[PDB]
Amino acid sequence: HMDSTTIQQNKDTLSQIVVFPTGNYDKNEANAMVNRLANIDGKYLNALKQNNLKIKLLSGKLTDEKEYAYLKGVVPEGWEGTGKTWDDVPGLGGSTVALRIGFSNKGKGHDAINLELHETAHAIDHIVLNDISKSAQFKQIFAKEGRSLGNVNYLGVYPKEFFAESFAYYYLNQDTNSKLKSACPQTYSFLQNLAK
Numbered sequence: 001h002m003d004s005t006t007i008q009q010n011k012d013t014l015s016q017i018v019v020f021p022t023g024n025y026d027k028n029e030a031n032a033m034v035n036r037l038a039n040i041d042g043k044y045l046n047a048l049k050q051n052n053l054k055i056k057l058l059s060g061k062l063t064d065e066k067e068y069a070y071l072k073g074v075v076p077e078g079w080e081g082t083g084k085t086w087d088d089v090p091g092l093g094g095s096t097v098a099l100r101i102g103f104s105n106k107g108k109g110h111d112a113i114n115l116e117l118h119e120t121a122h123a124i125d126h127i128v129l130n131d132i133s134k135s136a137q138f139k140q141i142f143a144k145e146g147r148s149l150g151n152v153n154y155l156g157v158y159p160k161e162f163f164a165e166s167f168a169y170y171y172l173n174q175d176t177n178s179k180l181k182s183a184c185p186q187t188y189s190f191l192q193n194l195a196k
């Protein structure tokens with residue numbers, strides 16, 4: 001069902017999680033990113049807020065921020081041989097979350113179906129759920145279904161990436177939610193029980 005009141009409730013929660021950048025930027029698109037984050041189960045959002053995880057929206061490069069200067073010139077895991085570095089990567093998630101405004105869609109310098117959901121899933125995985133993507137249960141599921149969203153040499157190799165991408169499929173919209181259920185039924189059930 002359409003749940004605009006739930007989206008509003010999660011947006012209110014996100015008002016204490018999202019950090020907007022200093023420069024000038026597409027304010028409507030930044031708002032759209034927060035709206036897409038509001039699709040995440042509010043339980044997870046409040047757990048992130050409890051741990052003081054900030055979702056930083058950026059108007060420049062990731063490596064333009066002081067706290068990510070250590071990534072200048074660094075080649076992401078699995079991107080070796082491409083000539084690309086973290087300077088060009090629009091999203092990072094884990095112990096922090098940082099997201100370049102405008103780069104949400106797949107192919108905008110990254111492979112995720114949605115940037116902000118993929119990166120925020122990393123933080124939920126790592127901060128809230130103590131690296132559940134490395135848990136024995138998820139490793140068994142990943143062994144069977146980890147290639148079934150495609151990108152078999154990336155998602156199919158790194159369980160934390162398969163977790164983050166599956167989470168993004170689960171929460172982006174009903175189409176991606178349905179595609180996940182069909183391609184990765186055990187992963188879908190796992191995320192269902194996790195939110196239950």
Ligand SMILES: [Zn+2]
Pocket residue numbers: 118122161164
């Ligand atoms: Zn990732």
